[PDB]
Each structure stands twice: as C-alpha cells, then as structure tokens.
Design a protein around this ligand. Structure first.
Ligand SMILES: *C(=N)[C@@H](NC(=O)[C@@H]1[C@@H]2[C@H](CN1C(=O)[C@@H](NC(=O)C(F)(F)F)C(C)(C)C)C2(C)C)c1cncc2cc(F)ccc12
Ligand SMILES: *C(=N)[C@@H](NC(=O)[C@@H]1[C@@H]2[C@H](CN1C(=O)[C@@H](NC(=O)C(F)(F)F)C(C)(C)C)C2(C)C)c1cncc2cc(F)ccc12
Lengths: 306, 306
C-alpha cells in the first residue's frame, strides 16, 4: 500500500541526453540513432530572441557552429535542419544506448515523467500532468531547455514533451518531439501568459479511488447523483465536465472498490461544497488531480517495465 | 522556478537490480560486483515466518537453492552468507554495470530516492523521508522487498535503504545495506507497529524558504521570535525541536531570501496557530516536511549528477 507521485525509471532516457552549444547558448539535446533533437531557439542571441526569424537565422549557421557533447566525448555535426520549433542535428555516431522509442503527443489531463537536465547531465526525475491550458507545473531553471518528458510502456519510451520556456506565473511550456507547441505559445519573448486553467475531474475521481484502496473512507456516503447533476456541480467549482467515457475508464476502479462511479461523484460533490473539515486524503488537504486512472491502477496493482 | 518532489535519476541503480528466488518466494536483489544483496526472509516459508530462526534455516540451504535472474540471464550462486538481516549471495559474474557506490546509514529527517521493483524489474521512482519514528511512507506491494533507497552525490550512489516489510498502518520498514533495521522492527510476523511520529521542523522551514524563492510570501510577517519561544510552540504541535545547528544549516537559504531564520520561525508559529485560512503554499494546503535544506538548495539552484 501507499500512494506517491511516482515517475518512470529514467535510465533509458538518461542514456540519450547530450549538451548542445551554439555561440554562447548551451542547452540539452536528445540523441536517438544519429540525430540530436533540441529547441531551435539555441541558435538565437539575446537580441535575436525579441522577434526572431528562424529560417534566416538558420541559413547563416554551419554544421561547425553546433558543439555537441555526449558526456566527455564530442560528436561531429554532419547536418542540420529545422522541423517546426526543434532543430535536428545529424551527427556522425548513432547513439548505442538508443532505446526502442516513439514520438507521441499527449492530451491535457495525461501524465508523464520529466528528466530535468543541465549541460546534458540529468539532475532529477519527477511526474507532471499536461494542464487543460497546455502548460505544465514543472521545476526548471536556466539551462533546462531540451529536457524531455516521457512515458514507458514495457520496454518502449514514448517521448511526449520537450521543454522550451517558463511563463511569468512560473509554469512551463514546450513542444512535442516533432516541434509543435503544446498550447498557444511561441518561442519568442512576447508578453504571452498561461491562460485560465481547470481541475481535471476524472483524475480527482481516480485519486479518490486510490484513497479507498489505501483505507481512507471518511468522504464516502450512501448518496448518489446523476451525471448531469454532477456536471452541474463541476462547472461551478471550475472542474472539467465528466463524460460517459470517463465513467467507463473508471470502471475497473469502481469494480475493485465496490463504489459505483456516480456514487464517488456524489462524494466529490460533497467535498467540493463542504471542504474537508480539517481531514486529509492520501496525505493531502487538497483534491489532487495529477493522477490518471492508469496511474492509480499502476501503483495500486504494481506493473513494471523492462 | 517551480518545486516538485524530485527523485535522483535512477539509471545507475536500475542496472543493479535482479530477481532472487528461493523456494516459492521471489523478491528483488541488489547486484554489486560479484555479490547479490537481498532480505534474508527470502529463505522463509509461510509457516517459517511466524517465529523464524534464521541461522537454522540458512544452514539447511545450498547455493543451488537460490535462483538469481539478471534480466533473462541466470547467475550461478557460488556462495551465500548472512549479515544481520540481509543475505549476501556470491555469484560467479561481477556486475559490469556496477556504479561507484557506498553503503551509508541515514538519519530520520533525511530524504532519499526509492526505485520500486518487482521480479527484478524497476517499476517507478519516488522520493521519501526517513520519519522520526524510523518508518518511511513508501508505496510498495507484494514482491517489492529488496527494492533499495539511495542518494547520488555526483557519480557515486550512496545506498541507504532496503525494503523488508509493511506495517499495519500502511507504512514501511527496512534495513540499511548492512542489514541493520531502521527502528525497532524485526523480520518476523509479530504485532509490531510504527509508534508515534513527529513533524520534521527544520524541513518545514526549508520548504517555506523554497516557497519564498518561488514567490509565495503571504505567510511572512515582520514579527520575530526567540529559539526558545519557538521551540515552546513546536512542542505543542508535535514538531521536533529546532537546534542551533538547524539554524546554521538554514543559513544559505536565509541569506538568499533576506529572511532571518528566527523570522521564518515566527511565520511558522503563526501558521501553526492560525492554519492557512484557505490559502496554499507551493501547491499544498499542509505544511510539508519531506524536503531537507539540501533538497531545496538543489532544485532552487540546480545541481546535476554524472
Ligand atoms: C531554457 N534553458 C530556458 N528558457 C528560455 O531561455 C526560453 C526561450 C526564450 C526565453 N525563454 C524563457 O523561458 C523566458 N520566458 C518567456 O519569454 C515567456 F515568459 F515564456 F514568454 C524567461 C523570461 C527567461 C523565463 C524562449 C521563450 C523561446 C528556461 C527554461 N525553464 C526555466 C527557465 C527559468 C529562467 F529563469 C530562465 C530560463 C528558463
Ligand atoms: C515484500 N515483498 C513484502 N514483505 C514481506 O513479505 C514482509 C516480511 C514478512 C511479512 N512481511 C510483511 O510485510 C507483513 N507485515 C508484517 O509482518 C508487519 F506488519 F510488518 F509486522 C505483511 C502483513 C504481509 C504486510 C516480514 C515482516 C519479514 C511486502 C513489502 N511491501 C509491501 C507489502 C504489502 C503486502 F500486502 C504484502 C507484502 C509486502
């Protein structure tokens, strides 16, 4: 038992991280087969980054303008190109540690592990959700651009996120590995801002089920509610609507606990209207929304990866 | 910016995990050089584990009673011995992935990363503190015994914890890597129980400093307090006493924020007496005590490991 924000083991990703230098800018790259992926704003200078023009900036660069450090070993760049907001640096060595991988784009509401990196050196790993407003509440300092987010499905790494920038509220914005931003953000220094967020309802319900599995039951009640009357209540407290597909996804968790999905919604309703009255759930005094139903089945059942 | 419970990159530990089978019991082992370390209760049966007698049980075993799986590769056990509560299985192959390592025993109040493992296969990584009562609030299911806790200091893995057992409150107990239990727990099936805990005061203060660095300031005040009058207040709310050495350890964080340690104690005093009045700190509605001053300097400054 127990319940933690748990990241995937990071070793397979650690073996892909490298340092990319262009000019006086150093950031992180992802080395898979003979390509290094990194944020294209590496080619910008301080005054470039105000309103930059990346096709112009890139034609003025040469392969030798890019220094790639794999540990204490240098890699010749033998080619370069831009794909959307990432750079693809072709190098003369295939990464012998290349795992089986995929480039996937995730949905707001889904979770992933982030291997925070500086100078190509992994610093720490932690779990994030893609917020409904397409930001992530990460932990990132200067030099962390190019760090990636990922999931692991048995032996295959599905890369979903590359870090580009921190917004003024202290949340983080980036791209999928094809260089397309999550949300309405651009790799320029404008006045862009997150935009209003919502709470991920289906995830909160999944986490209430994790609590019941781990013995917290005080918030249960005999009451019930209909999907419509619940979705009424979610809308007032700035929660996302719950769909029938969310109810279906919660099926396994409902069956394991014996608590019908709509009954747990009645509990959530009461928790939203009454607060928690000084009690806690899974060590939290807030309703937690960054565990998916998958995540809960994962720790409360115990699946591994090889 | 941002602040997360962040684990160390786990790759160096992942390359050490193996599966140990003896009879019908399977658990995890740690393979360093030519030795596999694992909980000695692997040699027990269901009826053995009531009041077991390990020297007797071990002399009845042979090297071939121990099946060791390193991935899909078997390792001959060529020797076995007991050291306190762990088994040392000498195998015929040195682990080529053996990192630089140390076996260290930690203090209640310190933190570490846990690589949860099943059947020798890493499942997830997360951050824990050693509670004042020598338990850890982990996340562990059947088969997770033998999973290890660790810290990384540049390139060297300091192993501090091996998982043995779950107590009835759902917290976890185990040993250091020399086989000596943390706290008053035994690898028998008795009625043993955690025993009363306290909140780790110095860690809460470190986390308030992390909040100030990340822009939460509402809990600040001009007030001050003396160490004695604060330690008075800690004792009522079941917080550990704060020592002058704790104040010294908080020095760097005090200097970076401009908030004297004893001033932050006055803030903590008010937070304990008044609650938080519906506000949050670093996304928490509770005072968090599982980040050390080191941990805070680590994310709010950005140190890596190679
Ligand atoms: C990566 N190592 C670094 N990010 C950047 O350098 C990006 C990149 C240009 C500036 N920038 C920013 O993150 C800035 N933010 C913004 O322009 C905006 F708020 F998002 F609009 C800023 C002001 C330096 C934070 C471009 C936007 C393309 C990076 C990554 N994570 C965190 C930080 C924190 C920092 F203090 C500095 C740099 C960070
Ligand atoms: C490891 N794979 C497993 N732990 C054990 O098998 C240990 C080990 C014997 C029983 N045990 C326990 O953890 C039991 N707990 C206790 O006896 C006590 F409460 F701590 F006193 C119990 C009742 C099965 C949980 C010895 C004590 C030496 C393990 C590890 N982590 C979590 C779990 C959860 C489980 F449900 C079962 C086994 C677990």
């Amino acid at each position: 038992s127990g319940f933690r924000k748990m990241a995937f083991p990071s070793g397979k990703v650690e073996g892909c991280m490298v340092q990319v230098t262009c000019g006086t800018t150093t950031l992180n790259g992802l080395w898979l087969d003979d390509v290094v992926y990194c944020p294209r704003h590496v080619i910008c200078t301080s005054e470039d980054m105000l309103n930059p023009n990346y096709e112009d900036l890139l034609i003025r660069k040469s392969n030798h303008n890019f220094l790639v450090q794999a540990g204490n070993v240098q890699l010749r760049v033998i080619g370069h190109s831009m794909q959307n907001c990432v750079l693809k640096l072709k190098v003369d060595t295939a990464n012998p540690k290349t795992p089986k991988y995929k480039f996937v784009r995730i949905q707001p509401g889904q979770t992933f592990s982030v291997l925070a990196c500086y100078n190509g050196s992994p610093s720490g790993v932690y779990q994030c959700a893609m917020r409904p407003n397409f930001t992530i509440k990460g932990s990132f300092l200067n030099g962390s651009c190019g760090s990636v987010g990922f999931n692991i499905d048995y032996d295959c790494v599905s890369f979903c996120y590359m870090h580009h920038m921190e917004l003024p509220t202290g949340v983080h914005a980036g791209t999928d590995l094809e260089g397309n931003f999550y949300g309405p953000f651009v790799d320029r220094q404008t006045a862009q801002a997150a935009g209003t967020d919502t709470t991920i309802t289906v995830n909160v319900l999944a986490w209430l089920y994790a609590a019941v599995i781990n013995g917290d039951r005080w918030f249960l009640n005999r009451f019930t509610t209909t999907l419509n009357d619940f979705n009424l209540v979610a809308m007032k407290y700035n929660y996302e609507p719950l769909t029938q597909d969310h109810v279906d996804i919660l099926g396994p968790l409902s069956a394991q606990t014996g608590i019908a999905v709509l009954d747990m919604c009645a509990s959530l309703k009461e928790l939203l209207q009454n607060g928690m009255n000084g009690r806690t759930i899974l060590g939290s005094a807030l309703l937690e929304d960054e565990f998916t139903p998958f995540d809960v089945v994962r720790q409360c059942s115990g699946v591994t990866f090889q």
